[PDB]
């Protein structure tokens, strides 16, 4: 809602911070297994349930 609580907005900020792909330099580290951001969220595909 537009009229929202600060706890909700803090979770919003956390989600916006997390909403990004893998940093590219991480792929170049030795013994790197991470291939892509497997926890990438999007508003059209999965609701946050908060």
């Amino acid at each position: 809602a537009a009229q929202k609580s600060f706890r909700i907005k803090q979770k919003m900020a956390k989600a916006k911070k997390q909403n990004r792909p893998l940093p590219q330099w991480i792929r170049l580290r030795t013994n790197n297994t991470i291939r892509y951001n497997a926890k990438r969220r999007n508003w059209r595909r999965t609701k946050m349930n908060i």
Binding site: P21, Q24, W25, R27, R35, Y36, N37, R40
Partner: protein, 57 residues
């Protein structure tokens, strides 16, 4: 935009060509995982527990 994320990644060690290539690889991997998920979930996604079936049985 005095300095861009392009400059930040260039100093981080990934150039523009490597950025584009790695991003394409990431989209490829996500698409492969998506294809696999649909293929596996099609088998048992249509198992509604309490479906009605107007013409019973």
């Amino acid at each position: 935009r005095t300095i861009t994320a392009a400059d930040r990644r260039m100093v981080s060690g990934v150039t523009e060509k490597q950025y584009k290539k790695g991003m394409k690889k990431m989209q490829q991997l996500e698409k492969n995982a998506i294809n696999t998920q649909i293929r596996r979930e099609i088998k048992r996604v249509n198992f509604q527990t309490h479906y009605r079936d107007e013409l019973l049985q």
